[PDB]
C-alpha cells in the first residue's frame, strides 16, 4: 500500500511491543547526538540489525521488523538514486543551491 | 566566521560565480533525481571536487571552494556525532519514533 500509510502504522507497532523489546538491558546501541536525522540512517539500521537477533522471533514482532525492512530498502534504493543521472553545471548548481539552502533554513 | 555566517556567504558566493562555472559546457556531473538532499551528501561532496579541478583558481572564486571545504568538514563532524554513545534500548527507540515521525510528519 502507501508506504505514506505504512510509516504511520509502523509508528502504532513500535508503541505495541517496547516491553518485549526493552526487556534486554544489557544492549547498548548507537543513538545520535543530533537530530538531522537522515544523515545517521544507517547507523539506525544497523541498530535496528542488533535488536532484531537479540529478539524473541514472536509472530507479531515480526510485522514489526517486516515494516522496517520494506522501509529500509526504499531508503537504500534512494542512496542509488543519488548518483544516476549525470547532467550539465547549471543543474547540479541549482540543485547544490538547493541543498545549502535547507542547511540555512531546516538545520540545527 | 561561523558556520551558519559560512553557509550565507557560499550561496551568495554561487549566485555571484554562476557564469564561471557554466562555462564549463562539456562536463557531466551526477545529480540526484529525488529531494532527498540529505542522503546523497557525499555524491554531492564529489561533485564539488570535480567542479573544483575544472576551474581557474587563484580569484574570488577560490572563497566558495575553500568555504565548501569547511562546510564538509562540518557535516563529517556531524556524522560520526551518529554512532559516538552506546545507549539503551529504550532510548535507542525514542530516536527511533523520532525518524519515523520525520519521514512521515516531517520530510524533506
Given at each position: 500500500?502507501?508506504?505514506?500509510?505504512?510509516?504511520?502504522?509502523?509508528?502504532?507497532?513500535?508503541?505495541?511491543?517496547?516491553?518485549?523489546?526493552?526487556?534486554?538491558?544489557?544492549?547498548?546501541?548507537?543513538?545520535?547526538?543530533?537530530?538531522?536525522?537522515q544523515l545517521c540512517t544507517e547507523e539506525i539500521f544497523?541498530?535496528?540489525?542488533?535488536?532484531?537477533?537479540?529478539?524473541?522471533?514472536?509472530?507479531?514482532?515480526?510485522?514489526?521488523?517486516k515494516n522496517l525492512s520494506l522501509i529500509k530498502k526504499?531508503?537504500?534504493?534512494?542512496?542509488?538514486?543519488?548518483?544516476?543521472?549525470?547532467?550539465?553545471?547549471?543543474?547540479?548548481?541549482?540543485?547544490?543551491?538547493?541543498?545549502?539552502?535547507?542547511?540555512?533554513?531546516?538545520?540545527?
Amino acid at each position: 500500500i502507501p508506504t505514506s500509510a505504512l510509516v504511520k502504522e509502523t509508528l502504532a507497532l513500535l508503541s505495541t511491543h517496547r516491553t518485549l523489546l526493552i526487556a534486554n538491558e544489557t544492549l547498548r546501541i548507537p543513538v545520535p547526538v543530533h537530530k538531522n536525522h537522515q544523515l545517521c540512517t544507517e547507523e539506525i539500521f544497523q541498530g535496528i540489525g542488533t535488536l532484531e537477533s537479540q529478539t524473541v522471533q514472536g509472530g507479531t514482532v515480526e510485522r514489526l521488523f517486516k515494516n522496517l525492512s520494506l522501509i529500509k530498502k526504499y531508503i537504500d534504493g534512494q542512496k542509488k538514486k543519488c548518483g544516476e543521472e549525470r547532467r550539465r553545471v547549471n543543474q547540479f548548481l541549482d540543485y547544490l543551491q538547493e541543498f545549502l539552502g535547507v542547511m540555512n533554513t531546516e538545520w540545527i
